[PDB]
Design a protein around this ligand. Structure first.
Ligand SMILES: *[C@@H]1O[C@H](CO)[C@@H](O[C@@H]2O[C@H](CO)[C@@H](O)[C@H](O)[C@H]2NC(C)=O)[C@H](O)[C@H]1NC(C)=O
Ligand SMILES: *[C@@H]1O[C@H](CO)[C@@H](O[C@@H]2O[C@H](CO)[C@@H](O)[C@H](O)[C@H]2NC(C)=O)[C@H](O)[C@H]1NC(C)=O
Ligand SMILES: *[C@@H]1O[C@H](CO)[C@@H](O[C@@H]2O[C@H](CO)[C@@H](O)[C@H](O)[C@H]2NC(C)=O)[C@H](O)[C@H]1NC(C)=O
Ligand SMILES: *[C@@H]1O[C@H](CO)[C@@H](O[C@@H]2O[C@H](CO)[C@@H](O)[C@H](O)[C@H]2NC(C)=O)[C@H](O)[C@H]1NC(C)=O
Ligand SMILES: *[C@@H]1O[C@H](CO)[C@@H](O)[C@H](O)[C@H]1NC(C)=O
Ligand SMILES: *[C@@H]1O[C@H](CO)[C@@H](O)[C@H](O)[C@H]1NC(C)=O
Ligand SMILES: *[C@@H]1O[C@H](CO)[C@@H](O)[C@H](O)[C@H]1NC(C)=O
Ligand SMILES: *[C@@H]1O[C@H](CO)[C@@H](O)[C@H](O)[C@H]1NC(C)=O
Ligand SMILES: *[C@@H]1O[C@H](CO)[C@@H](O)[C@H](O)[C@H]1NC(C)=O
Ligand SMILES: *[C@@H]1O[C@H](CO)[C@@H](O)[C@H](O)[C@H]1NC(C)=O
Ligand SMILES: *[C@@H]1O[C@H](CO)[C@@H](O)[C@H](O)[C@H]1NC(C)=O
Ligand SMILES: *[C@@H]1O[C@H](CO)[C@@H](O)[C@H](O)[C@H]1NC(C)=O
Ligand SMILES: [Zn+2]
Ligand SMILES: [Zn+2]
Lengths: 903, 4, 903, 4
């Protein structure tokens, strides 16, 4: 379309800026004569003309307008302004605008009001104002609910739907008299009967603070709640389906929500300004949760918790997700990104701060340590590609809803969190939170870019007279404006350090230039024979310092507790000393750094920076390792070996090796739990136990196979008395299905269909994908596409579980190639989780044959495109090419190593 | 956003 | 290349015709300084000029010439002829010629002699004069041996290498003094030391009869033999590796060979004219066996037999293959096809007559009945395609060695046999063999086309005053010159019959025209309530006769004992009466016709001529069927259902149905064999037992899984005392591997590597492909390509076993697409078994996705082409298109039927 | 020929 016309460009003009809106919405929770669920609404937006213009361009998506005074909208003056007549309106679908063409120009610095009357489908599409459904017995309950982020507020009413177009909102919901209406604010006066029909009530809500459109929420339901005033005076309510609330499944959320909210208010010296914060769990929900200001929405599996059937891992998810969305009340709601390219200012912050809040609520769990696995090493996988992207992408590259949704990714979340963890480490959290309090105070009810953050952290540094090698801006710009991270290579003979951009494939082509030349300013912590040394700043590509020189038996390690976003390599003599330490007394190295040694070496091997046998040798000590973290780091790195080798001669020896390495740990837990009667007291030990069972069973430990099949059989014999502790259910279910046949699968499927807990249904849904039978995986794939069987919110997640099964690989890849339009159009091609599907189905590719299929897939689907999975496809191409070379270079050496070390 |  | 030049055309000119040859060959059974095994030879061919020509075009393949008197050959006169000087020679590689350009023209009806001296590689390529290798302890034994058919005589010496260029051959072999030289004839005088080197002997053989080049054999080895003069005075010797002969493993062959040879001599009133018939088993051999006149060659698994370790099925293979190659002494050697387009005159005859000979040797086995399954129904699968071919293809279509090798197929063999079975039935074998004796007498030492056969059968008909609806030629031309066969549809209400060309896909496009309009003249036998009726001849597309009318409870069936090459359909009322008979007393229908009812209905369902539920209903009675044949027919037809559905939701219910149907039979055999301590007395019951075990275990009968795993475990515990009866080994090994893991697989692989019987190695080799683990199948695929691990003769057979496994499908198809040049060039792209690989890898295809891969495979490999698999690719395209439609039309009905009938 |  003609790019010279403003209505064909994706960003709004800067000519108009809204001040406030009133919106009335009326959902119809029974189908009409067409079989459609609809909502009807009206709106008035008051806006200021900032530059004279003869067009009003406003967002509108899938809305039908009722003509009023001869046009789709009515345009009125404010404070004496006299707007021109409307010529005509048009709906421009690609850019999602209503365009009001005027007979003259509006006047600079004058206000106007525009009135609309409209209707949309209350679709089961999880976007905008939409419907969620559940059963209470045989009664169908239909809920009207919302998801606006990123670009769906415009699907419920016409609005200037960009985050820096903040305004106040005056919401009215018209709803059946028996149902409760909820929104961001509390109701304004009593709910009155609708004059035209007293079967409906009218509920008006108090005006919102100045806020972004993507944070609006409107909900109509018959949910129940539990409530408690938090110590900062804010009312907390936990809302869910009546049966869940009655069962007590909202009680854990009530225990933690107010205390975390108060904690954040104190920690950031910035009060939460609203009278209440409702948490509400929806049966149908696209994302995990969403921080709507005053009305935080969640999947049921993220908010509800059953102490008798949910696992410890589920409990950790609840407190962390609550902490995450509450963090956004400050980092996202009060202070908001200027535009989506800087999304990490919301998501990177919430991803870091969630640990502070969760740790406050559950101080015995030691959750902050999990950042190394769950954020740092998670994101380093994609951020070692040439086709990664900077934490802050240039704003001009981010224009379409697909491009926006694409950024809800490991970079914005986990690299965001990692860089903040590093910043907190070198500043101290006291100095960090001081600068953040200043940032929040200055920009409250406004919008920010990354530079605004540095300015306020600098103010705290300057006040404390902290000396750094340069300004906060110049340090942190290196981590924010260019992709990737360095490997720091130490020569302990001379004490020299050097850095270079770490790429998993040496031959990959970095085409994004960096004005910083892929050189970082790096805060380097270190230990020598277990004792922490003085901190160091690496500012150049190479330096020398006696901190990094050793002689005799001494070893050094850099990046104590992996606070810095970088990998570390050493001369091979220092590596050998580290391996000797691991054999002599592995407890002499901090637990996080044991995970580091394993994960860094495996990644370095891929990049041809150490021999692969060095990385495999780093796993030898695991036979006597009981800690969760180093085992999880090993299993994560070896996931790649499984993806590369589970269709090859290398796989037997790999499994034999893992069987050997895990058997003593498995036997330890068998004994320590009094033959699985008890679970460990400490959370990390609980997780270690689960990984020991999973690893033992996957790799053929006979005692494990007998245990899981025995327990599952006992359950089948007593379906209402499940003998499996909730912590063990995912792994027992999966392995019992893998070891069994049609009978076990059918039992688990019936349990899934009859489930009355999302946590239990989720474990069964993943387990069913563990069948070794191709016909069963094919049948299960057909169920994922049937919304009567698997909720749409869960379709692509279940497909991913199937493709992760070696027998499901060909099945799902062939399905994806054959059904691309269907998946793109109906299964979230422009939404948040689409990249996950592309990543999962392609990560096994290691052959020229598969590469050629992938290239042909790209060519064949040019016209449809790849929506929010566009970058993921480019990454899949890069990785596949790297994998072909890696398998060629490593398959013989790896086969020999596993064979010779598994005996 | 959690993406889940 | 320029088609106007005779040396660029594939058929020899008619200008020259050989009379006789002398050939001296000297293999070198140790490598030279280059690491090559070579043979050196010389030849003189005496030939007659039939039309004046200035060029001698003779076949030559991979031979290097030693210059003599200035040129590659020397041309001399005979009986006073005075040949022109040679200008120059050239080797034209595509058409495999040596071309001798002369300075003048040869004279019509004059003789000439051409002398050559040459060298070739004694390659491990199983073609021409080649090497076979075995170990005796740690000593490497190297054998020089031959395979000339179809077009490889020219790879050993220059010759006019077409079957109608018959000549006498005077063979001399020069060989190490300690090794025995063998050829078609007996030695002529004693073996003398070579003058140049007494470490070598010179063995000259008596002149052959007039014969075709493709029947020559030259063998040098240290094999031993057993011998016996047959009752017709012919000396029989069975030759094999010394250890096999010493063990007595040639004794069964000695028991049957002479008696069968004498039987055929009597039956066809035509003596075997040679003084001896040697049978020899080679460790490396492309085909199963080859009828070289006087020196019949075999794979070891086709000639040798160990009464303590070979199965009854193996024993049947030995007697049938011997009978087959002996049949060729008459049908192929004494009388030979004029050209390869009429190959059925050799192979169709041997395929029919083998049963007569085998039945003579083993009259209690009832082998003749097996023709229905092993020939008739086997070939009807491919002969129901639009891309099938006539029994006698027009000669002008068959030109290249690839096109020739392609015809060694189900049409030439099994349709050949089927049409001869039909002919014998309507003539009687007495009249048939009378006409054949006349044919053999007239054309002895000459060549024939299909018309020559009809003339001599007509002579017998005329002598017996037998009245037919027309001449033998006109009846049999309908079955010989057009592809396909009719379905005969009976309306029992009116007694009407009609015929039409049976096509598995109604929508397929028959592009080959027939001058007979796809109308046949059909000899129709029938039974009414079990009593045979008068014979009938259907000559038109439709007719009426009271033979085919029924009323009340009466049923009729056509094609008693399936002697005719046609399928039969009935009105649904007659089908229901047949199904009632099967429920009331299935023994009232002849056993062959029970197989017919099952196999015909399944094929008819595919063609949309009966509902699929009618065909499935015909299998209900199998629950009480104990006979081998009807069960084997059902399992063969249901193979298609497995191929279509074993990656789908239909597969569980299909397996449940087969489990139900086979359980009582399995339990019957468990009891009758005194818990597997004994095998049935009757051969067909032995086969029924094996199918009952195979079917029970494949479809999940728990008692079967326990039995096979238990037996295999007992064997692993006592490797030198195998507890599994030879009849049960293939199925026990396969299912024990399928049920087990790495340990069972590794045990079986070591047993294979250490095997000292081809029969035992073959069972293990197939079993190893039954692993359900993708990584194990991938590793095994890599072994098939390593000639140190799996003999080249067995490579593609093992690949086929892997692709037949549902888990091996994607693996092998992806491999075939990625390695086409390698397979084409090194794994027999121009040879006999290549079509089998294409057929096996594609027969599961039932999706648009797979069709598109197949079409792209065709496009991508245009330049290489598909050699002797060209027609198979066209058939695979046709079937895949039919399969997509069939699955769409049938998947729901079939799912429901198996679900509702399996309980 | 048997093809085998
Ligand atoms: C949304 O509601 C608010 C609060 O009632 C409205 O704000 C008032 O606007 C009037 C008219 O411009 C002002 O004179 C008052 O001072 C405002 N009150 C407050 C507390 O700010 C606002 O106009 C409403 N917006 C729409 C579009 O209806
Ligand atoms: C991984 O560990 C193996 C085993 O220790 C190393 O190979 C050994 O190296 C030492 C010292 O060079 C030799 O003396 C041993 O004989 C080797 N043992 C074996 C069994 O091979 C190997 O070098 C390590 N890999 C790397 C990259 O350091
Ligand atoms: C192959 O050997 C045969 C038999 O010794 C040769 O046949 C003789 O040929 C001579 C010369 O032409 C005739 O006069 C004799 O009558 C033949 N004898 C018989 C029994 O037929 C034949 O020449 C040899 N062929 C070659 C090419 O060496
Ligand atoms: C296959 O057999 C089934 C089962 O007998 C046939 O369906 C039955 O048909 C009879 C007679 O028409 C009905 O009265 C029964 O109620 C049916 N039974 C069931 C269980 O459906 C079916 O018709 C047969 N298929 C064909 C093609 O004849
Ligand atoms: C909007 O209008 C279109 C075109 O008339 C119609 O198909 C659609 O159903 C309407 N949507 C609603 C919710 O009424
Ligand atoms: C509906 O309106 C009536 C007032 O007429 C009020 O008492 C009632 O609580 C309202 N109900 C809800 C669920 O808002
Ligand atoms: C919430 O806290 C109460 C009081 O401390 C405690 O008894 C209860 O177990 C907690 N509920 C949950 C679900 O953890
Ligand atoms: C820095 O100090 C000044 C002067 O005391 C104070 O006003 C300001 O708030 C401080 N800023 C920060 C970030 O601490
Ligand atoms: C035939 O000649 C070619 C070309 O010199 C050579 O490569 C080949 O080895 C020769 N073959 C034999 C068996 O000597
Ligand atoms: C080799 O030649 C000698 C005659 O010198 C003979 O006695 C011996 O049997 C021959 N051997 C073979 C195997 O042909
Ligand atoms: C061959 O025949 C003999 C004598 O009839 C018999 O004893 C022997 O068992 C037979 N050998 C084989 C291997 O069948
Ligand atoms: C037919 O009969 C004639 C005359 O008796 C006889 O010479 C000829 O061999 C016979 N042919 C056949 C095929 O029986
Ligand atoms: Zn978030
Ligand atoms: Zn044959």
């Amino acid at each position: 379309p003609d790019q010279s016309k403003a209505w064909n460009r994706y960003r709004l003009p800067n000519t108009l800026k809204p001040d406030s809106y009133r919106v009335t919405l009326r959902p119809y929770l029974t189908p009409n004569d067409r079989g459609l669920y609809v909502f009807k609404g009206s709106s008035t937006v008051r806006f200021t003309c900032k530059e004279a213009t003869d067009v009003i361009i406003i967002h509108s998506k899938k809305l039908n307008y009722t003509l009023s005074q001869g046009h789709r909208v009515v345009l009125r003056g404010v404070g004496g302004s006299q707007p021109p007549d409307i010529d005509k309106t048009e709906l421009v679908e690609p850019t999602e605008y209503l365009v009001v063409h005027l007979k003259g120009s509006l006047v600079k610095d004058s206000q106007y009001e525009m009135d609309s009357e409209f209707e949309g489908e209350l679709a089961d599409d999880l976007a905008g104002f939409y419907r969620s459904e559940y059963m209470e017995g045989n009664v169908r309950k239909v809920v009207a609910t919302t998801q606006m982020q990123a670009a769906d507020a415009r699907k419920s009413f016409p609005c200037f739907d960009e985050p820096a177009m903040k305004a106040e909102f005056n919401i009215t919901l018209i709803h059946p008299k028996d149902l409760t209406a909820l929104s961001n604010m509390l109701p304004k006066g009593p709910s009155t009967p609708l004059p035209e029909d007293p079967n409906w009530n009218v509920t008006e809500f108090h005006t919102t603070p100045k806020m972004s459109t993507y944070l609006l929420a409107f909900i109509v339901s018959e949910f129940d709640y539990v409530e408690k005033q938090a110590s900062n005076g804010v009312l907390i309510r936990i809302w869910a389906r009546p049966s869940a609330i009655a069962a007590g499944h909202g009680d854990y959320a009530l225990n933690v929500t107010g205390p975390i909210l108060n904690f954040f208010a104190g920690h950031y010296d910035t009060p939460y300004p609203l009278p209440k914060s409702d948490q509400i769990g929806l049966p149908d929900f696209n994302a995990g949760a969403m921080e709507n200001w005053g009305l935080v929405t969640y999947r049921e599996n993220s908010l509800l918790f059953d102490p008798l059937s949910s696992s410890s891992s589920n409990k950790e998810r609840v407190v962390t997700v609550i902490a995450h969305e509450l963090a956004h009340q400050w980092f996202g709601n009060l202070v908001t990104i200027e535009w989506w390219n800087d999304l990490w200012l919301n998501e990177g912050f919430a991803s870091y701060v969630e640990y502070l809040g969760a740790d406050y609520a559950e101080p015995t769990w030691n959750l902050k340590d999990l950042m190394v696995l769950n954020d740092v090493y998670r994101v380093m996988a994609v951020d070692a590609l040439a086709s990664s992207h900077p934490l802050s992408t240039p704003a001009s590259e981010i224009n379409t809803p697909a491009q926006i949704s694409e950024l809800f990714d490991a970079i914005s979340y986990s690299k965001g969190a990692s860089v903040l963890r590093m910043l907190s480490s070198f500043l101290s959290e006291d100095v960090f939170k001081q600068g953040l309090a200043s940032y929040l105070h200055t920009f409250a009810y406004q919008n920010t870019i990354y530079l605004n953050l540095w300015d306020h952290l600098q103010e705290a540094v300057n006040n404390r007279s902290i000396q750094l090698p340069t300004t906060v801006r110049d340090i942190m710009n290196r981590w924010t404006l260019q992709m990737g991270f360095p490997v720091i290579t130490v020569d302990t003979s001379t004490g020299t350090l050097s850095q270079e951009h770490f790429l998993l494939d040496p031959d990959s082509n970095v085409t994004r230039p960096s004005e910083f030349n892929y050189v970082w300013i790096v805060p380097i912590t270190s230990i020598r024979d277990g004792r922490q040394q003085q901190d160091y700043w690496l500012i150049d590509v190479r330096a020398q310092n006696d901190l990094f020189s050793t002689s005799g038996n001494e070893w050094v390690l850099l990046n104590l507790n992996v606070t810095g976003y970088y990998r570390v390599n050493y001369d091979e003599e220092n590596w050998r000393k580290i391996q000797t330490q691991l054999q002599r007394d592995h407890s002499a190295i901090p637990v996080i750094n044991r995970a580091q040694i394993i994960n860094d070496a495996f990644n370095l091997a891929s990049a041809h920076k150490v021999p692969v046998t060095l990385a495999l040798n780093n796993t030898l000590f695991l036979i006597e390792e009981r800690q969760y973290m180093p085992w999880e780091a090993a299993l994560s790195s070896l996931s790649y070996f499984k993806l590369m080798f589970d269709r090859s001669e290398v796989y037997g020896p790999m499994k034999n090796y893992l069987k050997k390495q895990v058997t003593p740990l498995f036997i330890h837990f068998r004994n320590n739990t009094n033959n699985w009667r008890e679970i460990p007291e400490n959370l990390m030990d609980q997780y270690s136990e689960v990984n020991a069972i999973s690893t033992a069973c996957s790799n053929g430990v006979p005692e494990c196979e007998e245990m899981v099949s025995g327990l599952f059989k006992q359950w089948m014999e007593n379906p209402n008395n499940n003998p499996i502790h909730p912590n063990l259910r995912s792994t027992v279910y999966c392995n019992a299905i893998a070891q069994g046949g049609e009978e076990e699968w059918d039992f688990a499927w019936e349990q899934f269909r009859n489930a009355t807990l999302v946590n239990e249904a989720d474990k069964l849904r993943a387990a069913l994908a563990c069948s070794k039978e191709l016909w069963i995986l094919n049948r299960y794939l057909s169920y994922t596409l049937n919304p009567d069987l698997i909720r749409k919110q869960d379709a692509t997640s279940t497909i991913i579980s199937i493709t992760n099964n070696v027998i499901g690989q060909g099945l799902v890849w062939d399905f994806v190639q054959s059904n691309w339009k269907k998946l793109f159009n109906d299964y979230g091609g422009g939404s948040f989780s689409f990249s996950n599907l592309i990543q999962a189905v392609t990560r096994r590719f290691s052959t020229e044959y598969e590469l050629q299929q992938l290239e042909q897939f790209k060519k064949d689907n040019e016209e449809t495109g790849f929506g929010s999975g566009t970058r993921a496809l480019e990454q899949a191409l890069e990785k596949t090419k790297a994998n072909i070379k890696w398998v060629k270079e490593n398959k013989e050496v790896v086969l020999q190593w596993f064979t010779e070390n598994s005996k | 956003x959690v993406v889940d």
